[PDB]
Amino acid sequence: QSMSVKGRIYSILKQIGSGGSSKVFQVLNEKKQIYAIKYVNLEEADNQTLDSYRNEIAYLNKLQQHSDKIIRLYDYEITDQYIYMVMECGNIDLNSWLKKKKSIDPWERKSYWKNMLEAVHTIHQHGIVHSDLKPANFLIVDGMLKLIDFGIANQMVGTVNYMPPEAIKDISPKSDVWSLGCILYYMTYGKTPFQQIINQISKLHAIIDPNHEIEFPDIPEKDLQDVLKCCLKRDPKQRISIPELLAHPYVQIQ
Numbered sequence: 001q002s003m004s005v006k007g008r009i010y011s012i013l014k015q016i017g018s019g020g021s022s023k024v025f026q027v028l029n030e031k032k033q034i035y036a037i038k039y040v041n042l043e044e045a046d047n048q049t050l051d052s053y054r055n056e057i058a059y060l061n062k063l064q065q066h067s068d069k070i071i072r073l074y075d076y077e078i079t080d081q082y083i084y085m086v087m088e089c090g091n092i093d094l095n096s097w098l099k100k101k102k103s104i105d106p107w108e109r110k111s112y113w114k115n116m117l118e119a120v121h122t123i124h125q126h127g128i129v130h131s132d133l134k135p136a137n138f139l140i141v142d143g144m145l146k147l148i149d150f151g152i153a154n155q156m157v158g159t160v161n162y163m164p165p166e167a168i169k170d171i172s173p174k175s176d177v178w179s180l181g182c183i184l185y186y187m188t189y190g191k192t193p194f195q196q197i198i199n200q201i202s203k204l205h206a207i208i209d210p211n212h213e214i215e216f217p218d219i220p221e222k223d224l225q226d227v228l229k230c231c232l233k234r235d236p237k238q239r240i241s242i243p244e245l246l247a248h249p250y251v252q253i254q
């Protein structure tokens with residue numbers, strides 16, 4: 001119920017996240033300030049894994065100044081057994097909140113989409129394709145949305161629902177546009193595009209079969225309907241680019 005990271009001592013309040021060999025805590029510094037610490041455990045970490053983590057941290061740290069739609073990382077300590085990462089404490093990850101939330105105020109959802117693009121666009125500039133975006137990857141801070149991770153590090157929920165067809169036979173920035181697509185879709189018709197389907201092989205075949213009409217129910221926002229149709233184009237060159245998505249009317253026009 002208390003840790004030290006580069007000497008400084010943080011008092012845990014609760015555990016606000018967990019995965020792989022990693023806990024995330026909500027904590028207080030000396031000046032009674034709040035943070036999130038991600039403890040990562042390395043005692044079972046193979047070499048490539050150990051690099052993957054060093055890489056992912058390298059980058060998280062870097063693209064701090066290149067954008068505020070990326071979770072802040074204030075400090076880290078790193079040794080052969082553990083990594084501790086001192087980030088800002090968000091309110092909730094997107095995915096938890098989408099679950100609880102009734103329907104989403106159109107203005108909020110568009111605002112959020114703008115941050116998904118700002119964030120993701122940043123990492124593509126730097127060579128990174130995330131190639132595994134789900135709601136879980138984004139954290140609401142001060143009603144603003146930030147990318148947490150860059151999919152660079154290895155693992156220790158399986159989920160095919162956000163997966164772009166061109167990687168249902170195995171890298172492009174277009175892969176992330178699909179996933180962001182499914183995230184927006186989720187935020188729009190309250191489901192992912194291939195959720196109804198339960199047979200995960202029937203599903204995997206649905207995502208690649210151009211014979212499969214993806215439905216996009218009529219909604220007031222014709223701006224928004226376009227963007228979904230545009231992001232969910234099974235051919236990666238058919239698909240809309242992110243610099244295109246940032247000038248799109250849905251995100252551009254009042």
Ligand SMILES: CCc1nn(CCOCCOCCOC)c(CC)c1NC(=O)c1ccn2c1CCc1cnc(Nc3ccc(N4CCN(C(=O)COC)CC4)cc3OC)nc1-2
Nearest residue numbers: 016017018019022036088089090091092093096137149153
């Ligand atoms: C921890 C397992 C994991 N592995 N990876 C992959 C890479 O990391 C492992 C390798 O090491 C490299 C480091 O990568 C950064 C990721 C990315 C999504 C995850 N998830 C996270 O890192 C991860 C998940 C959440 N966080 C983080 C990091 C920073 C943070 C700040 N703030 C928050 N805030 C927050 C998040 C969640 C919540 N709860 C929990 C969810 N809600 C519930 O419904 C309760 O049920 C569990 C209630 C709200 C409350 C919060 O505020 C107090 N959350 C996180």
